[PDB]
Ligand binder design. Structure first.
Ligand SMILES: *[C@H](O)[C@H](C[C@@H]1CCNC1=O)NC(=O)[C@H](CC(C)C)NC(=O)OCc1ccccc1
Ligand SMILES: *[C@H](O)[C@H](C[C@@H]1CCNC1=O)NC(=O)[C@H](CC(C)C)NC(=O)OCc1ccccc1
Lengths: 304, 304
């Protein structure tokens, strides 16, 4: 029993982290086959960062201007190209620790593990959701850029995130491994707005299922509701509208617990309308939306 | 910016996990040099578990009765010994992936990362505190025993925990790597009581410091207090009494933020006496006690 914000084991990603230095700027790179991926803003001086012309800045750089270091080992750069907001440095050496991997553009509401790195060395690992407004609630200091978010599927590492910047609200923004930002953000040191941040309804429901499975049942009420009725209440509280697809995804959890999704919806509506009255669910005094239905079933069936 | 429940990178511990099978029972083992460590209750049948005589049960077992598997690789067992509640299986092969390591008996209030495993394969990683009552609030299913808790100090893995059992309250109990239980627990399937579970005051203070550092300052009040006065209020709310040692440990955080420990104590007293009035601190609606002062300074200075 017990339910915990659980990260993927980080060993296969640790083996891909390198240090990328261009002039004074140092951040983390991802070393897969003979290509090192990092944020293109490694080429910026603190001045460039206010409104950089990446095209013009990159032209003053050649392969020898990119210092790539794995442990104490200095890699030889034999090619450089800019793809959106990612720099790809061709190196003479294929990473002998390259896991089986894919690049995936993850959907809002899905989760992933962040391996927070500095100077190409791992610091720690934590689970994040891609929020509806394409930000994450991370822990990132200077030097953390190039740190990556990933899922593991048995042997296959799926990289989905590369850390780039912190917004004025203190939340975090980054790119997929093709260098395309999640959300409307650009890699320049200007004030940038994430949209209103809405709660991931299907994830809140999964976590209430997770709680029921763990013997927290107090919030279970005598009521039911419909999607429209519930969605009226969802809109009021900035919850994402629930859909039959969301119901279908919860099916396994519904069928395991024997609690109809719309009954759980009625429970959530009363939680949302009355608060928790100083009570807690799975050791939290707020409704948690950073667990997917998959996250719940993995942790509850002991997937490795 | 940002503050997250962060686990250590798990790569060095992943390389030490093996599968130990005795008869039908399978759990995880830790493979360091030519010794595999696992819970001695691997030798129990479901019947034995109610009141096992480990001495008599172990005597019916020889080296060939211990099936040790690393990946698809079957290790040869050339020796077995019981040390408290741990079985040490001597194997013919030294683990070529053995990290630099120590066995440490960790203090209550200190934190560690758990690499949750099944069949010797990693499932995920999360941070736990050893509670004052020598239990942890984990996520552990059947097969999870042998899963270990550890800290990393640069190159050195410090193993402190090996998972053994879940108590009726749904919290978790285990041994150090010498097989000595944390707390009054024994490895038998009987009802066992952890003591009253008290809050780790020094950790709550570190986290309020963590919050101030992250721009959450609302709870900062105009009051101060003394240790005795504060400790009167601590006893009332089942907080561990605060000591000059605890103050000295917070010194760095106090000196960084410019907020006296006793002023922060006065803030905590009002939080404890008035609750949070529906407000949140670092995205929590409860006072968090599973961050040590070290945890806060590591995450805030980007230690790797
Ligand atoms: C990459 O290492 C860095 C990560 C920032 C630093 C502090 N917390 C983060 O997430 N990214 C940047 O510095 C980024 C570079 C621009 C070219 C996009 N700029 C940025 O994030 O500005 C906001 C900020 C900078 C420094 C401290 C706090 C916030
Ligand atoms: C080790 O794999 C297992 C871990 C339990 C299983 C479910 N959650 C856990 O932490 N440990 C035991 O099964 C342990 C063996 C005794 C000889 C100590 N017994 C135990 O934990 O009893 C409580 C329990 C058993 C099964 C399910 C739920 C609770």
């Amino acid at each position: 029993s017990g339910f915990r914000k659980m990260a993927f084991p980080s060993g296969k990603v640790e083996g891909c982290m390198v240090q990328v230095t261009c002039g004074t700027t140092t951040l983390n790179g991802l070393w897969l086959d003979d290509v090192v991926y990092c944020p293109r803003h490694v080429i910026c001086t603190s001045e460039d960062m206010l409104n950089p012309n990446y095209e013009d800045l990159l032209i003053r750089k050649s392969n020898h201007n990119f210092l790539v270091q794995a442990g104490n080992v200095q890699l030889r750069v034999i090619g450089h190209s800019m793809q959106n907001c990612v720099l790809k440095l061709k190196v003479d050496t294929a990473n002998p620790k390259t896991p089986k991997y894919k690049f995936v553009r993850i959907q809002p509401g899905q989760t992933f593990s962040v391996l927070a790195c500095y100077n190409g060395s791992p610091s720690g690992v934590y689970q994040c959701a891609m929020r509806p407004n394409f930000t994450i609630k991370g822990s990132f200091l200077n030097g953390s850029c190039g740190s990556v978010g990933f899922n593991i599927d048995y042997d296959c590492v799926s990289f989905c995130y590369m850390h780039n910047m912190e917004l004025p609200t203190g939340v975090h923004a980054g790119t997929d491994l093709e260098g395309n930002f999640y959300g409307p953000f650009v890699d320049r040191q200007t004030a940038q707005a994430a949209g209103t941040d809405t709660t991931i309804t299907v994830n809140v429901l999964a976590w209430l299922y997770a709680a029921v499975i763990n013997g927290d049942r107090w919030f279970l009420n005598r009521f039911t509701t419909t999607l429209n009725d519930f969605n009226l209440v969802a809109m009021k509280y900035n919850y994402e509208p629930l859909t039959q697809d969301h119901v279908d995804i919860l099916g396994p959890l519904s069928a395991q617990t024997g609690i109809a999704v719309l009954d759980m919806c009625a429970s959530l509506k009363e939680l949302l309308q009355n608060g928790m009255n100083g009570r807690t669910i799975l050791g939290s005094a707020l409704l948690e939306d950073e667990f997917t239905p998959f996250d719940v079933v993995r942790q509850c069936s002991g997937v490795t």
